[PDB]
């Protein structure tokens, strides 16, 4: 029932990315990013309970995924400092957002699943 | 289930529903004999394709019939279908998740293998 | 001016994939694939001069990228036996086809660029 | 040719993305982004002359690909506000960097092709 959930996959090992730092920001009135939520992916590669529907108000959100630390913890030098997704949430009604990221050392793919 | 298929649509930001999936096994004469079939559910998943008893070791081909998916939406695609060919259960029983992300002129596939 | 090009990229080293075997098969009237063209990607991970425009006719073509040999040479055990792309070519006129593939050990993505001469 | 190049592709129509705004930033000493370069994609979806070797110095760069405006011009409402790539460049000597982005309305994949001249 979480409005926002983040799923991270490893394309080199073919397993969920475990213990990946995820930071969520909201755009402020002065075009600044303020901290909104944080967490780390579980052993299933997904992060639940980031925020409730009461907090998850309409705005422009930034989901920052700390891919650099994850690849460094595996002894791999990556290219991107981080993989982050900027999107507008709850523009027309509350929706449940899933941010799926597929990670490689020098490339990444991200897709969104938006439902009601 | 030891073999699961998940399909996602990168154009509409939703799971791909009612997508035909056909599983083949390479025979002794390099021939693909039918093994399992189904269609993705409302969540874009295909459950209960096989059981570990009959999911013997061998080369398996998972054909995701993408062209029929796009024609039912009014889009003329490029690929005739998306096919994933892999060796399964070579070094002991495993659980396989085939994930595909579909675009009219592109697609990406990934696999998650977990030791039970 | 070749109407069929194959470009292959590596998503792990962030470099073009070099010396990747690429086999092109054409579908016959009895639902089997018969060889049409073959070659290996160059130092820039590209494959030009596969055939000629007149020889490249309407039909269903299969491009197999032998990714498993690429990963085994690199010392990585992959998941996919190969990356095969099957498409209908020249359905409504002579087009130029570029097949681009991005490779990871357990995943890959492919795309196509189609232009009208 | 140029130390920085951007390639943008469109996976919905299978053609290069034409006239796509690309912005390049450089991180300042106070952890702020200062403008570095900008341009629009050519007929082949490429950016050239965006910078040369001596301007393109070691640092943390942000390549912002304005995908939202591209999809609106096509009558498509996208998901991401932009495609946004942060990386460190020339940390061990000058390199040629090619950013390649494949765009879909609700997804995008980006890859880098780093070469040593």
């Amino acid at each position: 029932k979480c409005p926002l959930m983040v799923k991270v996959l490893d394309a080199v090992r073919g397993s969920p990315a475990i213990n990946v730092a995820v930071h969520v920001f909201r755009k402020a009135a002065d075009d600044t990013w303020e901290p909104f939520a944080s967490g780390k992916t579980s052993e299933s590669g997904e992060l639940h309970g980031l925020t409730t529907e009461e907090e998850f108000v309409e705005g422009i959100y930034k989901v920052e995924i700390d891919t650099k630390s994850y690849w460094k913890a595996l002894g791999i030098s990556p290219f991107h400092e981080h993989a982050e997704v900027v999107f507008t949430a709850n523009d027309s009604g509350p929706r449940r957002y899933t941010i799926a990221a597929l990670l490689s050392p020098y490339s990444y793919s991200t897709t969104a699943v938006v439902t009601n």
Side-chain angles (χ1 to χ4, degrees), chain A residues 10-115:
Chain A
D10 190 311
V12 188
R13 302 144 86 212
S15 63
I18 322 293
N19 189 358
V20 176
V22 168
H23 295 299
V24 187
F25 308 84
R26 214 201 299 111
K27 185 173 276 296
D30 49 353
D31 275 3
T32 70
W33 294 108
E34 65 183 1
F36 175 79
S38 186
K40 292 181 181 180
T41 42
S42 64
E43 59 263 32
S44 187
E46 43 179 23
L47 178 45
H48 301 282
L50 272 156
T51 179
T52 187
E53 293 179 353
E54 328 304 319
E55 293 179 353
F56 198 46
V57 298
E58 172 186 27
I60 292 182
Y61 288 90
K62 176 158 91 133
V63 181
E64 189 276 331
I65 303 167
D66 197 13
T67 77
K68 209 188 166 51
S69 300
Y70 172 76
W71 291 118
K72 288 302 217 53
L74 306 176
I76 298 171
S77 175
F79 174 78
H80 309 82
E81 291 282 311
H82 56 74
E84 71 90 9
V85 177
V86 178
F87 65 101
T88 287
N90 317 302
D91 48 36
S92 44
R95 317 218 191 190
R96 300 175 66 189
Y97 294 82
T98 306
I99 305 294
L102 185 56
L103 298 194
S104 287
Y106 268 74
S107 88
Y108 72 87
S109 187
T110 175
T111 187
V113 184
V114 179
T115 179

